[PDB]
Amino acid sequence: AASTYTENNILNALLRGVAFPLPAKTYVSLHTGDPGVGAGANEVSLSNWPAYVRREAEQGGAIGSGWTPAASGQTSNVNQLTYPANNGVAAVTVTHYAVFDAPTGGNLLFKAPLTVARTLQVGDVFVFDVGSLTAQ
Amino acid sequence: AASTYTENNILNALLRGVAFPLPAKTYVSLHTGDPGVGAGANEVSLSNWPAYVRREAEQGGAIGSGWTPAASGQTSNVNQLTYPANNGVAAVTVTHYAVFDAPTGGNLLFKAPLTVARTLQVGDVFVFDVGSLTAQ
Amino acid sequence: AASTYTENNILNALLRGVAFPLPAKTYVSLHTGDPGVGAGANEVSLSNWPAYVRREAEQGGAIGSGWTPAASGQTSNVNQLTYPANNGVAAVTVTHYAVFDAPTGGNLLFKAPLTVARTLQVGDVFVFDVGSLTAQ
Numbered sequence: 001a002a003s004t005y006t007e008n009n010i011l012n013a014l015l016r017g018v019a020f021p022l023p024a025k026t027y028v029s030l031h032t033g034d035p036g037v038g039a040g041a042n043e044v045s046l047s048n049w050p051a052y053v054r055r056e057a058e059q060g061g062a063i064g065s066g067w068t069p070a071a072s073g074q075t076s077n078v079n080q081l082t083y084p085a086n087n088g089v090a091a092v093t094v095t096h097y098a099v100f101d102a103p104t105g106g107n108l109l110f111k112a113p114l115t116v117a118r119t120l121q122v123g124d125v126f127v128f129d130v131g132s133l134t135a136q
Numbered sequence: 137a138a139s140t141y142t143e144n145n146i147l148n149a150l151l152r153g154v155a156f157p158l159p160a161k162t163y164v165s166l167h168t169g170d171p172g173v174g175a176g177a178n179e180v181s182l183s184n185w186p187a188y189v190r191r192e193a194e195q196g197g198a199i200g201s202g203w204t205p206a207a208s209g210q211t212s213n214v215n216q217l218t219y220p221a222n223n224g225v226a227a228v229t230v231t232h233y234a235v236f237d238a239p240t241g242g243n244l245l246f247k248a249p250l251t252v253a254r255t256l257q258v259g260d261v262f263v264f265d266v267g268s269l270t271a272q
Numbered sequence: 273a274a275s276t277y278t279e280n281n282i283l284n285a286l287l288r289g290v291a292f293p294l295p296a297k298t299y300v301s302l303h304t305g306d307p308g309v310g311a312g313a314n315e316v317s318l319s320n321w322p323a324y325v326r327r328e329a330e331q332g333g334a335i336g337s338g339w340t341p342a343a344s345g346q347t348s349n350v351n352q353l354t355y356p357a358n359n360g361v362a363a364v365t366v367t368h369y370a371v372f373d374a375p376t377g378g379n380l381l382f383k384a385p386l387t388v389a390r391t392l393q394v395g396d397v398f399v400f401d402v403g404s405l406t407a408q
Contacts, residue, residue: 004208004209007206007209007272008205008208008209009206010146011203011206011209011211011271011272012205012206013146013156013158014146014235014245014246014271015159015162015202015203015211015235015245015271016199016200016202016203016205016206017158017159017160017161017199017200018200019156019158020149020155020156020158022149022153022155022156023151023153024153026151026153059360063152063153064152064153064154066152067148067151069148070143070144070147070148071144072140072143072144073140073143073147075147075151075152080394082358082359082360082395084357085356085357085397099151109150109151110150123354123397123399124397125357125358125395125396125397126395127393127394127395135147135151136143136147
C-alpha cells in the first residue's frame with residue numbers, strides 16, 4: 001500500500017538504474033477519506049479544519065532524524081507530532097494518514113489505515129505518540 | 137519477496153533521506169532452494185552446473201535498457217535472457233531466481249520464486265522469454 | 273494572597289479617597305513557580321510552551337461578563353477559558369495562576385495556588401471550567 005509515484009521510483013532505482021529522488025523533508029498528512037493511491041489524496045481535511053498545518057516529522061532535524069535506521073525493515077516516528085487544535089464549527093473525523101514531501105502536493109509517499117479511525121471534536125489536539133507510524 | 141538489504145535501502149531513502157545505492161548493472165541468477173532473504177542465497181547452483189555465468193540483463197545497453205520504465209508498477213525484461221548450456225553430471229532443479237548487483241555476492245535486490253518449478257536436464261539452455269521476470 | 277499593587281490601590285480607595293483604576297480587560301495566566309506577589313511573576317511559562325496567549329475572560333462580553341457580581345464575596349469564571357494547545361518541546365508543569373490586565377505583564381491583580389497542581393504533556397489544551405477561579 002504505497003503510491004504509484006514512490007513505487008515507480010523504487011522500481012526505477014532498483015532496476016532501471018535511474019537516480020532515486022530524495023525527500024528534503026517529510027510531512028505527515030491526514031485524510032478524512034481513504035487516499036486514492038495517486039498523486040494527491042481523496043481527500044485532505046479543509047473547509048472543516050481552519051488549522052491544518054503539515055506537522056513535519058523531525059521538526060528540528062534537517063533530514064534523517066525523523067525515522068529510526070532500518071534494520072530488516074521497521075521504523076518509528078521518533079519526533080512526536082501535535083496537530084493544532086480544532087478551531088471550531090463542525091466536528092472532524094480522521095481515518096487515514098499519508099506522507100507528503102511538500103506542504104501542498106509534492107507527491108505522496110505512504111497511505112496506511114489507522115487501527116481505530118479517530119475523530120476530532122470542537123477542540124482536540126490529536127497528538128501522535130513516539131513509536132507509531134511503523135512501516136515495512 | 138524483497139531482501140532485507142533492498143528493503144532497508146528503499147525505506148531509508150523514502151523516509152530518512154539516505155542516498156539510494158544504484159546498481160550500475162543487473163545480474164539474474166538461479167538457486168536450488170530459496171535465498172535466505174539476506175546477502176547471498178541458499179544456495180547458488182554450482183559444482184552441479186560447471187558453466188554458470190550469471191547472464192546479466194540488458195547485455196548491450198549500459199543502463200536503462202533492460203527493463204521498461206515503471207508505470208503504475210510492473211516491469212518487463214526488454215532483452216531476452218538465455219543461460220549457457222547445461223554441461224553435464226547430474227540434473228539440476230531451479231525454482232527461485234535472484235537479481236544481483238555483482239556477479240558474486242554484492243547485495244541482493246530481488247528474490248522471487250518461479251511460477252513453474254523447472255529442472256534442467258543433461259542438455260538445457262533455460263531461456264527466459266521476454267515478458268517474464270516481472271517485478272513490482 | 274493579593275498583589276502589592278492591587279492591595280495598595282484597594283486600601284487607598286478605602287481610606288485616602290484616591291480613585292481606583294478600572295481593569296479595561298481581564299487576563300488569566302499560568303506560572304510554574306509562585307509569582308513573587310510583586311510586579312511581574314516568577315515565572316511565566318515560555319520557551320517550553322510556545323503558545324502562551326493570555327486567554328481573556330468574557331471573550332464575548334465587552335466588560336462585566338466574566339464574573340458574577342459579588343454576593344458577600346465569591347467569583348465565577350462565567351466564560352470558560354480554553355488555552356491554546358501546547359505546541360512542542362517537552363512537558364510543562366502548571367501550578368499557580370495569576371490574573372493580569374495587559375496581554376503581557378501590565379500589573380498583577382491576583383496570585384493564588386490551585387487546588388491541585390496540573391502537569392501538561394506535549395499536547396494539552398488546559399481548559400478552565402465554568403465556576404472555577406473563585407475569589408473572596
